[PDB]
Coordinates of C-alpha atoms and ligand atoms in Angstrom, one line a residue:
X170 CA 8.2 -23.7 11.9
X171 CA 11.9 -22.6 11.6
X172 CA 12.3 -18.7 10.7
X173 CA 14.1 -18.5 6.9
X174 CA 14.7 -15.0 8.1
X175 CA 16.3 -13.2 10.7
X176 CA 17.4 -9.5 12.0
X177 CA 21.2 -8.1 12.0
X178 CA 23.0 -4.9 12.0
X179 CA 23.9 -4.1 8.4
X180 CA 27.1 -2.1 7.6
X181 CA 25.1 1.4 6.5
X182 CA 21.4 1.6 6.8
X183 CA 20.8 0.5 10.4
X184 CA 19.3 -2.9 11.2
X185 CA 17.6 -5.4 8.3
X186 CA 16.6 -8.5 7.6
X187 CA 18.5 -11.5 5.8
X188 CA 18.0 -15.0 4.5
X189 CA 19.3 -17.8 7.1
X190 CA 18.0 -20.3 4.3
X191 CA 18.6 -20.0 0.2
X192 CA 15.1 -18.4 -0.7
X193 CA 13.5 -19.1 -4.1
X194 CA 10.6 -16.8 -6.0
X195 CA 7.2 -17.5 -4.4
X196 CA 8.7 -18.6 -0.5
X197 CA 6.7 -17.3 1.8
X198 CA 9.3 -15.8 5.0
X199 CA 6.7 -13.9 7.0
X200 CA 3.3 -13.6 7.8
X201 CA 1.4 -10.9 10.3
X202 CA -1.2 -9.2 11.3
X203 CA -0.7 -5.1 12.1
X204 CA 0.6 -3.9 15.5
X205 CA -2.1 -2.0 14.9
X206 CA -4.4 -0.3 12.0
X207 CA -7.0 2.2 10.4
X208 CA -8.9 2.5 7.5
X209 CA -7.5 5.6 5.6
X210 CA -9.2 8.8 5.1
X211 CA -11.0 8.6 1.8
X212 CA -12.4 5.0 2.0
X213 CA -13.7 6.0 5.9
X214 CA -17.3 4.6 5.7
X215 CA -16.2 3.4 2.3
X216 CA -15.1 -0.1 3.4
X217 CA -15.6 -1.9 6.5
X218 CA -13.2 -1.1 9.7
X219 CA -12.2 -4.4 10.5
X220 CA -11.9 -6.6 7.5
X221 CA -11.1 -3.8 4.7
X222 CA -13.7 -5.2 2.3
X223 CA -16.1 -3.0 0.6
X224 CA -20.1 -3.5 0.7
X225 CA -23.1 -1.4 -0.5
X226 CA -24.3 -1.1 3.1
X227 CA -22.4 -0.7 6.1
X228 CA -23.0 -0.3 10.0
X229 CA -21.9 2.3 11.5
X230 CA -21.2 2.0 15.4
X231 CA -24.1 3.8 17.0
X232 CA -21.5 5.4 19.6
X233 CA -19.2 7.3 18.1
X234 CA -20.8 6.8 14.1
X235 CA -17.1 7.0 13.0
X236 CA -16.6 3.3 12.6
X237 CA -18.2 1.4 10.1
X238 CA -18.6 -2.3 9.7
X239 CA -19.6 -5.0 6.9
X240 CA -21.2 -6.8 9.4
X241 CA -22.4 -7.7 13.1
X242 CA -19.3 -10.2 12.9
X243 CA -16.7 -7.4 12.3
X244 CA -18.4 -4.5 14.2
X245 CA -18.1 -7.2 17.5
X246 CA -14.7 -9.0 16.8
X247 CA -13.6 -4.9 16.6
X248 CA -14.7 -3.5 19.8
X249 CA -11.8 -4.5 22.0
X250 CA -9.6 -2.6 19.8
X251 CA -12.1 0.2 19.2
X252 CA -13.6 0.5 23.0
X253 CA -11.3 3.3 23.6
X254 CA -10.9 5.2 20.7
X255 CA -14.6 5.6 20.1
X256 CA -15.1 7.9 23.5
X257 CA -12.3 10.1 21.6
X258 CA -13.7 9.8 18.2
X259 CA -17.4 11.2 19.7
X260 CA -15.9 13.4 22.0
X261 CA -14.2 15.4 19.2
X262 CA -17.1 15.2 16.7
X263 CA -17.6 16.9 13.9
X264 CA -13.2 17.0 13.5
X265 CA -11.8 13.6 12.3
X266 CA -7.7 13.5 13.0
X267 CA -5.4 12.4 10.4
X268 CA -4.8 9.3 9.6
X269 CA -1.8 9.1 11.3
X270 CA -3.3 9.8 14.6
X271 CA -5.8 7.6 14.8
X272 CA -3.0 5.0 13.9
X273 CA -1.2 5.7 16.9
X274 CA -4.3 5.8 19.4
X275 CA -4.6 2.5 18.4
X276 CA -0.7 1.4 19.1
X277 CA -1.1 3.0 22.7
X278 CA -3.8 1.0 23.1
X279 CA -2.7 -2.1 22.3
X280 CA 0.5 -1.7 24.1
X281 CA -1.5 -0.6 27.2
X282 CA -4.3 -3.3 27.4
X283 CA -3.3 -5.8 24.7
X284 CA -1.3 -8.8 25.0
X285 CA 2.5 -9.2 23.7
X286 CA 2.0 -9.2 19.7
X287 CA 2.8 -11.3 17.4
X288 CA 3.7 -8.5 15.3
X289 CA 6.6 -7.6 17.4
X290 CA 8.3 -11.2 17.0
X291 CA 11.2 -9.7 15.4
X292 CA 11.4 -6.2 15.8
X293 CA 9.3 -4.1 18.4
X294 CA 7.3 -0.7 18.2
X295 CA 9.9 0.5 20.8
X296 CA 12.9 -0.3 18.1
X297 CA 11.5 1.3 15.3
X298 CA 13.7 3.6 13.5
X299 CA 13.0 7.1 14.0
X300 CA 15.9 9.3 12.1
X301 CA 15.0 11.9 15.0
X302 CA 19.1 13.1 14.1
X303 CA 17.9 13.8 10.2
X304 CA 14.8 15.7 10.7
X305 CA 15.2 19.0 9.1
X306 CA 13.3 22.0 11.6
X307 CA 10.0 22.0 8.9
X308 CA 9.6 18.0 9.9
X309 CA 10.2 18.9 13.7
X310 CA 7.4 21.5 13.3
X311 CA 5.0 19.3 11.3
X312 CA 5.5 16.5 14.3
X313 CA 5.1 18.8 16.9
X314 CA 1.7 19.9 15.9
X315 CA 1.0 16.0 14.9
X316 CA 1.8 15.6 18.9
X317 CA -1.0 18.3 20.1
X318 CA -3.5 16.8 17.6
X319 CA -3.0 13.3 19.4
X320 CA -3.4 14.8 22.4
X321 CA -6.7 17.1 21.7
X322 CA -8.1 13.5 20.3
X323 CA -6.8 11.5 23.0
X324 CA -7.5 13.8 26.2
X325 CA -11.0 11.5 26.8
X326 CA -8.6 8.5 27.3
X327 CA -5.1 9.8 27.9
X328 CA -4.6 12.4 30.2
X329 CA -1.1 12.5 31.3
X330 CA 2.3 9.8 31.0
X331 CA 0.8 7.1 33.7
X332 CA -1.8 6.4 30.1
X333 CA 1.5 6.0 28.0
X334 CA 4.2 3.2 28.0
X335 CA 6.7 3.9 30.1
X336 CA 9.2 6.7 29.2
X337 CA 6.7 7.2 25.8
X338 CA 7.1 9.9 23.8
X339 CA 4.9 11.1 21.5
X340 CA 7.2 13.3 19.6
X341 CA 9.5 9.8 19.0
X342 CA 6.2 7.9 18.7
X343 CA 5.1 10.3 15.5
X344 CA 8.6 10.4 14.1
X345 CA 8.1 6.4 14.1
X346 CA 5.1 6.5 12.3
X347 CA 6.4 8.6 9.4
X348 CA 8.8 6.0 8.2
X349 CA 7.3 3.1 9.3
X350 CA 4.1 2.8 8.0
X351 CA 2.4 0.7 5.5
X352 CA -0.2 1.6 3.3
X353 CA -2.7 -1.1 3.2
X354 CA -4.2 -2.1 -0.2
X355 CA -7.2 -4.1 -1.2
X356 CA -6.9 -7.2 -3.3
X357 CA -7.8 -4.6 -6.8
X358 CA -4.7 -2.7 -5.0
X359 CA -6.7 0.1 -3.8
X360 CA -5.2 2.1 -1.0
X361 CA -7.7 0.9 2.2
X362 CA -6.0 1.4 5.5
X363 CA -2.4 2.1 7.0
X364 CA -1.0 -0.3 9.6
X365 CA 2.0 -0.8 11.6
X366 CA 3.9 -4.0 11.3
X367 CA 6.6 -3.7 13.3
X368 CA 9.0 -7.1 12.2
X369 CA 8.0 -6.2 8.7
X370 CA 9.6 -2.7 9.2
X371 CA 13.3 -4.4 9.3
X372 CA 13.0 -4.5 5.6
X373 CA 15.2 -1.4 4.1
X374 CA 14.0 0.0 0.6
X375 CA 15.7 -1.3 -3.2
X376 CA 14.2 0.1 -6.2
X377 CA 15.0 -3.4 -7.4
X378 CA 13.9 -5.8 -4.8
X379 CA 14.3 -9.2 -3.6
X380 CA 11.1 -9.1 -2.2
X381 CA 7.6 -8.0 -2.1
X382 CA 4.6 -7.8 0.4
X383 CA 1.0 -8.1 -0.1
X384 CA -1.9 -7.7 1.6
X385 CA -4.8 -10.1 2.4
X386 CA -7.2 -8.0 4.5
X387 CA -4.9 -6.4 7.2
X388 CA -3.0 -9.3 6.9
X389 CA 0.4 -8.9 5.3
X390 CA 2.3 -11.8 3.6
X391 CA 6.3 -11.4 2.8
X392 CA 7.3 -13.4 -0.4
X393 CA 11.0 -13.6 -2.1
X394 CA 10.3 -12.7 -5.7
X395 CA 14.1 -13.6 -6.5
X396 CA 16.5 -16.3 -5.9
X397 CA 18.3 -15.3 -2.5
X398 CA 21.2 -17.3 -1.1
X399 CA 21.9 -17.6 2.7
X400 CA 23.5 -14.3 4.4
X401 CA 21.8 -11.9 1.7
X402 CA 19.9 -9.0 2.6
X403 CA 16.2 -9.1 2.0
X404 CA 14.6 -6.0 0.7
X405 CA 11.2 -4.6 -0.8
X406 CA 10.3 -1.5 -3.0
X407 CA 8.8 1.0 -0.7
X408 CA 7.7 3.2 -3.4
X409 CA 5.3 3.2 -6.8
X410 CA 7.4 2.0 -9.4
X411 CA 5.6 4.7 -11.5
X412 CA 8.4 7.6 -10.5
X413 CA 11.4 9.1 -11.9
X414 CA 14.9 8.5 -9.8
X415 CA 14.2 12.5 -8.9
X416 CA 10.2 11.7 -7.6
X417 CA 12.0 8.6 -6.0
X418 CA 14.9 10.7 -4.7
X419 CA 12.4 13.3 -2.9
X420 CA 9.9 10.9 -1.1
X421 CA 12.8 8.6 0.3
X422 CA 14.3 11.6 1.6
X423 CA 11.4 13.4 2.9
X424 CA 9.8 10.3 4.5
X425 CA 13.2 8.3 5.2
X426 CA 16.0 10.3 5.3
X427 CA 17.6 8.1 3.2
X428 CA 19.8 9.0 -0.1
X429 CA 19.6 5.8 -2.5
X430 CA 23.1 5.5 -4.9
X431 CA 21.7 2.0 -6.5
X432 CA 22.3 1.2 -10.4
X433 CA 18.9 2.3 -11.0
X434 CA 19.3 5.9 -9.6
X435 CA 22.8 6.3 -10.6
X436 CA 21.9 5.7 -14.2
X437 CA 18.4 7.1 -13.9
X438 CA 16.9 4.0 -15.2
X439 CA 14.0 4.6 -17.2
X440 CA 13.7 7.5 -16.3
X441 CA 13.5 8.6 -19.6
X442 CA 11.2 6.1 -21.3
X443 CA 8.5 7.1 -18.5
X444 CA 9.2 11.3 -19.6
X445 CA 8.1 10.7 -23.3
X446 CA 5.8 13.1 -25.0
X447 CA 6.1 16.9 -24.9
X448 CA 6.4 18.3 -21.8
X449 CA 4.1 21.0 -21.3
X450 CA 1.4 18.2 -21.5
X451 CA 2.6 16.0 -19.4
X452 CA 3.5 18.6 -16.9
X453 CA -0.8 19.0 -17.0
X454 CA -1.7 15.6 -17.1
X455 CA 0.8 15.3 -13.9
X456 CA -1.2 18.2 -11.8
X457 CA -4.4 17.0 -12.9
X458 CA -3.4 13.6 -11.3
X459 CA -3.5 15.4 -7.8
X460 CA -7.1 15.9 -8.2
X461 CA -7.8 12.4 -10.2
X462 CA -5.8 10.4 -7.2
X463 CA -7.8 12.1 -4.8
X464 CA -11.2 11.6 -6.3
X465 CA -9.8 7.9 -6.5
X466 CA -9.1 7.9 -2.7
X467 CA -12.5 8.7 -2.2
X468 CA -14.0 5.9 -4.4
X469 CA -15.6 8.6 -6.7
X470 CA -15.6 6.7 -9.8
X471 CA -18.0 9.1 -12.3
X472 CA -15.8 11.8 -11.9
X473 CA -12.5 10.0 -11.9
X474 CA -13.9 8.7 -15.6
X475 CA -14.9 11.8 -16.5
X476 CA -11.9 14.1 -15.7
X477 CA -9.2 10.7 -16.8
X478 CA -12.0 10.7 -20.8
X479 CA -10.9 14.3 -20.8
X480 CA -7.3 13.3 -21.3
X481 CA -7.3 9.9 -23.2
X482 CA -9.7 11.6 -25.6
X483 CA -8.7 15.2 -25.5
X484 CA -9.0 17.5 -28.6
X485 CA -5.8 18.7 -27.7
X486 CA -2.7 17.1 -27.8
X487 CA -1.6 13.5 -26.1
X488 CA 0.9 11.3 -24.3
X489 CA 2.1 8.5 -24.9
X490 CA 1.1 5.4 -23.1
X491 CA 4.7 4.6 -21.7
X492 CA 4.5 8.4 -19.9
X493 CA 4.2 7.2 -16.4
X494 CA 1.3 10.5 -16.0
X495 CA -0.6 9.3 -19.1
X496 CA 0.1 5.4 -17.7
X497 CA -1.3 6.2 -14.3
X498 CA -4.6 7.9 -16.6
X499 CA -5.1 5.1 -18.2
X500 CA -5.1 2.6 -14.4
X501 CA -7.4 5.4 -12.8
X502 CA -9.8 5.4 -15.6
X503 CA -9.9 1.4 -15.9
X504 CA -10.3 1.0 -12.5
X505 CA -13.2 3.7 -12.7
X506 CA -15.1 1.6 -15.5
X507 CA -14.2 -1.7 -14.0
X508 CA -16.2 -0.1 -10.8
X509 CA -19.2 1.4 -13.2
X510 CA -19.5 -1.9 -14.9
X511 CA -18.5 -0.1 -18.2
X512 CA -16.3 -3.3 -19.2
X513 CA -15.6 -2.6 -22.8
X514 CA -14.2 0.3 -22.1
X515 CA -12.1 -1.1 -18.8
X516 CA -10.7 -3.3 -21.7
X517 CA -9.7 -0.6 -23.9
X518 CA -7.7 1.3 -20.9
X519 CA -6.6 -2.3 -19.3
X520 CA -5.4 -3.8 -22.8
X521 CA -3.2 -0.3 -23.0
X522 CA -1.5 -0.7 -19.9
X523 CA -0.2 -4.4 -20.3
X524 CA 3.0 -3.6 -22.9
X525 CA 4.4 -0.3 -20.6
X526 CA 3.0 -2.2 -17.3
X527 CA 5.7 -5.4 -18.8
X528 CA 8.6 -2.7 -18.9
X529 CA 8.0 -0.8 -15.6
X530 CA 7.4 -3.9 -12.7
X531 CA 10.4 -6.4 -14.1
X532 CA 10.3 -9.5 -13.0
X533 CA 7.1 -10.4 -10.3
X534 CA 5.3 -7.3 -8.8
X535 CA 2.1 -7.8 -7.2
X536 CA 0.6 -4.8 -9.2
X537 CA 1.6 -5.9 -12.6
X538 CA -0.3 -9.7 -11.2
X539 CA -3.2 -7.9 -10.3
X540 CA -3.7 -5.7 -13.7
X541 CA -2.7 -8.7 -16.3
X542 CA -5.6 -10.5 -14.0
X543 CA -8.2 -8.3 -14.4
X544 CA -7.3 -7.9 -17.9
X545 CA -7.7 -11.4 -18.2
X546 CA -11.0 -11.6 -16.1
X547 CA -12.6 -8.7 -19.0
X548 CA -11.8 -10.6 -21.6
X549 CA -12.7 -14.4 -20.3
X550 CA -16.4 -12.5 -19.6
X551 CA -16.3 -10.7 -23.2
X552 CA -15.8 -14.6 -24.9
X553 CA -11.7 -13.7 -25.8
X554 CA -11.2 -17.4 -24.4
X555 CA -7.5 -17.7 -26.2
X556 CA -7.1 -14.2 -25.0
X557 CA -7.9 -14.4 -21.5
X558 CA -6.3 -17.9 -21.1
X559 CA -3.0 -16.3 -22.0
X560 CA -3.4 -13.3 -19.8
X561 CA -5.5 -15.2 -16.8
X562 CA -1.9 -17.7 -17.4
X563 CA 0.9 -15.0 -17.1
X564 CA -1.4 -13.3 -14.1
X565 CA -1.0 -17.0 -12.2
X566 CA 3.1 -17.4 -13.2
X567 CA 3.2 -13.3 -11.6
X568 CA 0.9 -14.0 -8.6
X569 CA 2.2 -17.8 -7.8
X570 CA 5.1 -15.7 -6.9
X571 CA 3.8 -12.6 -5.2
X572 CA 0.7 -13.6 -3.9
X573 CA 0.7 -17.6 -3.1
X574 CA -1.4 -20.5 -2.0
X575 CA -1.9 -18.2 1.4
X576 CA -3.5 -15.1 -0.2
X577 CA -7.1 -15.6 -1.2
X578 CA -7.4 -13.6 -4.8
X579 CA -5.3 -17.1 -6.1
X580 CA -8.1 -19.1 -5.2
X581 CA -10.5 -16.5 -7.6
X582 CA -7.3 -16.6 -10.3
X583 CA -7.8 -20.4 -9.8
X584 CA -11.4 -20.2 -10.7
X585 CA -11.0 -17.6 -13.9
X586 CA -8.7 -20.3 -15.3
X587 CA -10.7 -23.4 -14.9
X588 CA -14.2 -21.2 -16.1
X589 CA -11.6 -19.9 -19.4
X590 CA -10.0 -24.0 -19.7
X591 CA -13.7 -25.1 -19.8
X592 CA -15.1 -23.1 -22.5
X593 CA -11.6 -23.6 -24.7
X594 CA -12.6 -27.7 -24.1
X595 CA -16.2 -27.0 -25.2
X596 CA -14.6 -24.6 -28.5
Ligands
LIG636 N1 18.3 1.4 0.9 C1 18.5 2.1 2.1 N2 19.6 2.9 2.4 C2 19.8 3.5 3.5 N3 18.9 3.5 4.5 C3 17.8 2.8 4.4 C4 17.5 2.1 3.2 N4 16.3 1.4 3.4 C5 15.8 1.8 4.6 N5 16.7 2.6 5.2 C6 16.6 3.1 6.5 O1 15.5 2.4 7.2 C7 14.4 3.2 7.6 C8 13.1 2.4 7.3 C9 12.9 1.1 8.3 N6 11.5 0.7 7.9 C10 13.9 -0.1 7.8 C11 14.7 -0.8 9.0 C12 15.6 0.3 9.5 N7 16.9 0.2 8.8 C13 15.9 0.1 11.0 O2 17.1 0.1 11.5 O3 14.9 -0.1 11.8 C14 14.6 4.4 6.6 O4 13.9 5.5 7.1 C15 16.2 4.7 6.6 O5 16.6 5.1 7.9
LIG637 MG1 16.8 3.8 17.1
LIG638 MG1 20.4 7.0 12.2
LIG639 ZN1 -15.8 -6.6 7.8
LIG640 ZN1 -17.6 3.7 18.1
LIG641 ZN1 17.7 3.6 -5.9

């Protein structure tokens, strides 16, 4: 198959991608697998190490008992790219490294003993952007100790530069890392795993895209979710859209030393719709997030409910449901009673979400898909047939787009809307 896509130099942020053919919303340009990949800290024995899927049992690998796996199936198809790691992973036990290390055990690896990847088609580990020339001296410091973390973990494996690519530097390597990675998500869009995908990684940021990936598994499909004509630049969102132009301003220069002067953080776009409600409550409901988002992480569902109830329902006073702090509430705690099989109430917090969910991810965003869907899928199994049809329908004309025939939650969409087209027939 002919590439739609392919790498050039822009004029001002470093290399890209563009369109060599017009692109319409829905084309699929790119598919890969990771460079390489983890499962992230809070859903570690959470969901299984290979395929990112979550089960009420796993196996752990008797070895190193770090690794966890769904099945026989995944625990063997995953020891090539675990052999190696797991004599580092039991040699430093009861300390588990950060995510970030682990990440790039696992590109040494499979840039030592694995063949050329796929991944690399377009763009290569070894080209990856690493702003070394921004780094302010508290980043420097950070990777520095990131570098002697990798090699306490490592020293079972790697002992000196003949272990390493050649002329590999960790210090580069790490600086890589920070504004190249993706954070894998599950198909309910639960953070799972971080991955490198290296020809992925020529997409620079808009907070207004012209595309959008998803993942499938580790596997990551590229869509356009606009009309793109031949020559253009293709771009994706790298951040939530739940933020502020400031929030947005801060991560894209602390992660990419990048300073955005788009329409949408010239003007501050909506940034003032997602600030309604007084202040001093929001200002809570934002640092009581830290610990909500972390119990999340972690797949603690009882007391994500409980702490999210607290707010929703508090005696005292409340936000509005456009607040982006009181918005990402209401998700948290829907996702928490989805989990806990408390679906009435899933309803109540998902039906809440849909009219601000419309106004912040225009257009087709795979997030916006994903909630109208299960929205959809609580209502078609509460008997809101007209209901659900409408919302199982807009959750197929968003995910047609974002997702595609390729990704397998549009075959489960599929089946929602022929159950739902059934029992209107039989009405
Ligand atoms: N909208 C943008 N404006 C300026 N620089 C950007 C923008 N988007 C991405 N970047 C740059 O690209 C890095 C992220 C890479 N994943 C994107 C490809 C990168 N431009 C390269 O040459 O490899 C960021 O850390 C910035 O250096
Ligand atoms: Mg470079
Ligand atoms: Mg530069
Ligand atoms: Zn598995
Ligand atoms: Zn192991
Ligand atoms: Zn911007």
């Amino acid at each position: 198959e002919p590439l739609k896509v392919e790498k050039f130099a822009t004029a001002n942020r470093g290399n890209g991608l563009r369109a060599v053919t017009p692109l319409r919303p829905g084309e699929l340009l790119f598919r890969s697998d990771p460079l390489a990949y983890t499962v992230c800290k809070g859903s570690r024995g959470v969901v299984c190490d290979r395929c990112l899927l979550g089960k009420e049992k796993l196996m752990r690998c008797s070895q190193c008992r770090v690794a966890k796996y769904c099945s026989a199936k995944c625990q063997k198809k995953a020891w090539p790219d675990h052999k190696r790691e797991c004599k580092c992973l039991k040699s430093c036990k009861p300390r588990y490294p950060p995510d970030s290390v682990r990440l790039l055990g696992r590109v040494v690896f499979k840039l030592m003993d694995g063949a050329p990847s796929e991944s690399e088609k377009l763009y290569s580990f070894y080209d990856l952007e690493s702003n070394i020339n921004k780094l302010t001296e508290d980043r420097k410091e950070g990777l520095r100790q990131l570098v002697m973390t990798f090699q306490h973990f490592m020293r079972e494996e790697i002992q000196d530069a003949s272990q390493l690519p050649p002329a590999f530097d960790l210090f580069e390597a790490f600086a890589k890392v920070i504004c190249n990675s993706f954070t894998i998500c599950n198909a309910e869009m639960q953070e799972v795993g971080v991955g490198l995908y290296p020809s992925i990684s020529l997409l620079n940021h808009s907070c207004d895209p012209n595309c959008s990936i998803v993942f499938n598994g580790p596997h990551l499909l590229l869509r356009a979710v606009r009309d793109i004509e031949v020559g253009e630049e293709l771009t994706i969102c790298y951040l939530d859209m739940l933020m502020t132009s400031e929030e947005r301003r801060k991560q894209l220069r602390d992660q990419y030393c990048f300073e955005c002067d788009c329409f949408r953080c010239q003007t501050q776009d909506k940034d003032a719709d997602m600030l309604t409600g007084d202040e001093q409550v929001w200002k809570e409901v934002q640092e009581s997030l830290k610990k909500i988002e972390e119990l999340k992480a972690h797949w603690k569902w009882e007391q994500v409910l409980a702490m999210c109830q607290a707010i929703i329902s508090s005696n005292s006073e409340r936000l509005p449901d456009i607040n982006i702090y009181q918005l990402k509430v209401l998700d948290c705690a829907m996702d928490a009673c989805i989990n806990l099989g408390l679906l009435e109430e899933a309803l109540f917090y998902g039906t809440r979400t849909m009219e601000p969910y419309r106004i912040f991810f225009p257009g087709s965003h795979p997030v916006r898909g994903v909630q109208v869907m299960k929205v959809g899928k609580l209502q078609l199994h509460q008997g809101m047939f007209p209901q659900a049809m409408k919302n199982l329908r807009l959750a197929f004309d968003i995910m047609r787009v974002t997702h595609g025939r390729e990704h397998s939650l549009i075959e489960d969409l599929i089946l929602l809307l022929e159950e739902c087209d059934a029992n209107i027939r039989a009405s």
